[PDB]
Amino acid sequence: GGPSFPEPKVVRSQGGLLSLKLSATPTPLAIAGQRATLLTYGGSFPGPTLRVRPRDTVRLTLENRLPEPTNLHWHGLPISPKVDDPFLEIPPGESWTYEFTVPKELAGTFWYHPHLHGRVAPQLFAGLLGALVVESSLDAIPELREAEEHLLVLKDLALQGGRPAPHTPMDWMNGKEGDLVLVNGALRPTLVAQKATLRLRLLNASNARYYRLALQDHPLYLIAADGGFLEEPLEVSELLLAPGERAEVLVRLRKEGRFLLQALPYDRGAMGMMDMGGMAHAMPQGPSRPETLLYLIAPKNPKPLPLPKALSPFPTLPAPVVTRRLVLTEDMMAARFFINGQVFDHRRVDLKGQAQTVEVWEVENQGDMDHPFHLHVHPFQVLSVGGRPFPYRAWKDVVNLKAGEVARLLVPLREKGRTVFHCHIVEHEDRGMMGVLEVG
Ligand SMILES: [Cu+2]
Ligand SMILES: [Cu+2]
Fold first, then answer.
1. Eight-state DSSP code of residue 137
2. Alpha-carbon torsion 436, 208, 109, 316, what sign?
3. Number of neighbours of residue 186 by Cβ within 10 angstroms
4. Which sign, positive or negative, has the C-alpha torsion 1, 186, 270, 264?
5. Under 8 Å between Cβ of 397 and 341
6. CA distance 302 to 328
7. N or C: at which end does the chain have fewer Cβ atoms within 10 angstroms?
8. Distance in angstroms (rounded) separating the CA atoms of residues 119 and 67
9. How many CB atoms within 10 Å of residue 307?
10. 396: which DSSP letter?
11. Could you state, in order of their start, the residue ranges of all structural domains in the chain?
């Protein structure tokens, strides 16, 4: 219908159930004017979008048709770590059925991807990822109902010989970024808007690339973070999305025209090669070059909707019972990454907490790179970074830490069981930067 825009196929719950068999398989596909064989869920890159409502039952059978073992992480879903099991291994040729109920208060954009320790970064870079959208009753208010909605999966790629490029020694240190900077698997698509207000769900599913998002001539109005709505729209001139983060923004198209959505230059502290360089700064890579992500064409004679005056009030959380300190460190040349001086050991429990309590977590980046900290299973509220207040109230599950920054997080502990926390530059996770939390 009308102009086409590349976007993943959507699978929706029906009568309160989303039952779906999803195969993880090598798949030859068309991509950026060539043919490449990626690893995909459901024969597509990105994988299919699962769309559900609160209280729905999800029954996803993952069919491993890969040459190596794999599993799934249900990124951002506050469900049982016995379902969202970071230690599970599904051998090649076997299947596993994940069954869970969507929590009643949940809303926003989530995603799924591999979490088999040691193999995350190659598997995710090869194409294995998809989005999960939880609908909200709030989507029925006129200021959002009549917006034109789209998912934008931000995911870069690099190809060599018609397959995902191999990880190099520098990739294990810096995280791998690709030369093909894609939106929904397409190179610089064009979105011909048919409404003047857009609602864009944004997902950074890249291994390591950061997207400093800016739309030409337009602010963004942030209405949702990783794990739920803000309390009211927040206008920003630009929006930094670290790996694993999601956001939902409203765009209000004022004038006709063609506007670029760009990822503006951002320096995440990646390191370059040789120790010599010209004479200035020798071996930091420096800021990313700007990238055009997509072209946005405004409709004829645009008149946008008013912004909603309110969204979702954020629950007051109880007083915390424990303070934890988690210090991130790195040894760049060995490409090894630590939390409180240790690398991940799946046989080691690093933190022991109580169900139905709130903790404060102080996460300190004592490295020189940005590290985006992710905690499975338990969404958190960011109170402050660097001793200054966070700009909004919303559930998050990834918080970006620049070099030297300390984040203070309010972490309500929900489901019992053993789960993990890790950097979501997934190369760093594979090379050490993960620990184990047990709730009882
Ligand atoms: Cu994730
Ligand atoms: Cu990291």
1. G
2. positive
3. 17
4. negative
5. no
6. 48
7. N
8. 12
9. 15
10. B
11. 1-135, 136-312, 313-440
| Binding-site residues from annotation for Cu(2+) | 73, 75, 113, 115, 281, 371, 374, 376, 422-424, 428
Determined by X-ray
Helices (DSSP H) in 131-256: which residue ranges?
142-145, 169-174
Resolution in units of Å:
1.7
Helices and strands (H and E) in the chain: how many: 4, 34
Binding-site positions: 73, 75, 113, 115, 281, 371, 374, 376, 422-424, 428
CA of 371 to the centre of ligand 2 (A): 4
Q: Is the peptide bond prior to 46 cis by the omega test (within 30 degrees of 0)?
A: yes
Residue 210 forms beta bridges with which residues?
none
The Å distance, Cα 113 to ligand 1 centre, comes to 6
Q: What are phi and psi of 121, to 5 degrees?
A: -65, -45
The vertex-230 CA angle with 226 and 234, nearest 5°, equals 110
Q: Which two tokens stand for residue 55?
A: 């209280």
Span from the CA of 109 to the centroid of ligand 1 (angstroms): 12
Ligand 1 center to 155 CA (angstroms): 13
Ligand nearest to the CA of 226: 1
Residue with tokens 């984040």: 407
Centre of ligand 2 to C-alpha 153, Å, is 21
In the beta sheet, which residues pair with residue 399?
373
> From the CA of 374, which ligand is nearest?
1
